Paper text:
The Kamer and Jarvis groups have extensively studied the human steroid carrier protein (SCP-2L),23 a single-domain 13.5 kDa protein containing a hydrophobic tunnel, as a scaffold for ArM design. The steroid carrier protein type 2 like (SCP-2L) domain of the human multifunctional enzyme 2 (MFE-2) has previously been used as a protein scaffold for both regioselective and enantioselective reactions using covalent modification through the introduction of unique cysteine residues. Here two methods for site-selective incorporation of bipyridine into the SCP-2L scaffold were compared, and the copper-catalysed 1,4-addition of indole to enones was used to analyse ArM activity. Crystals of SCP_Q111CBpy and SCP_Q111BpyAla were soaked in solutions of Cu(ii) ions and their structures determined by X-ray crystallography.
Author numbering: 5 to 127
Write the structure that this text describes.
């Protein structure tokens, strides 16, 4: 019953327009625990430490630099721009473990699509 799955799947293709530039600026692994009810429904890893990046189901193959835990609905609230991640973090709806600062980066980076998309041009 998970809507985030669409977002994570679509992310794998976005990294073809954006991957190599994100990896250069982030250089870290991110694990995501999506919860339905109060139970984990899906786990996702966004590896941004090599190449254009990787997104795969399940816990981080290696050790993850940061892990984020939030409900499936709230995850949609965030990716749609309605729920600021820090507001969710301090209200308790979003939980973050590891290097929080690196997730706040992944956030700034991906909100500026123009810089990294053009820098990903070969021409
Ligand atoms: C707004 O700048 C990004 C330009 O590309 C967006 C095209 O997609 C339509 C907008 O809907 C989306 C799609 C994907 C996303 C995610 C969550 C995958 C973030 C992204 C596109 C930066 C990887 C957010 C909104
Ligand atoms: C010290 O800061 C205190 C508040 O901490 C907030 C921690 O942030 C949690 C994660 O922040 C995010 C939120 C969304 C995202 C995106 C939208 C880029 C994730 C995505 C593209 C995988 C949907 C990245 C990082
Ligand atoms: Cu922001």
């Amino acid at each position: 019953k998970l809507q985030s799955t669409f977002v994570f799947e679509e992310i794998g293709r976005r990294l073809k327009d954006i991957g190599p530039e994100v990896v250069k600026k982030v250089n870290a692994v991110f694990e995501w625990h999506i919860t339905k009810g109060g139970n984990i429904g899906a786990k996702w890893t966004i590896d941004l430490k090599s190449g254009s990046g990787k997104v795969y189901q399940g816990p981080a193959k290696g050790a993850a630099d940061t892990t984020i835990i939030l409900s499936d609905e709230d995850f949609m609230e965030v990716v749609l721009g309605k729920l600021d991640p820090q507001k969710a973090f301090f209200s308790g709806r979003l939980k973050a473990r590891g290097n929080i600062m690196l997730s706040q980066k992944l956030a700034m980076i991906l909100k500026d699509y123009a810089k990294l998309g053009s820098e990903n041009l070969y021409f």
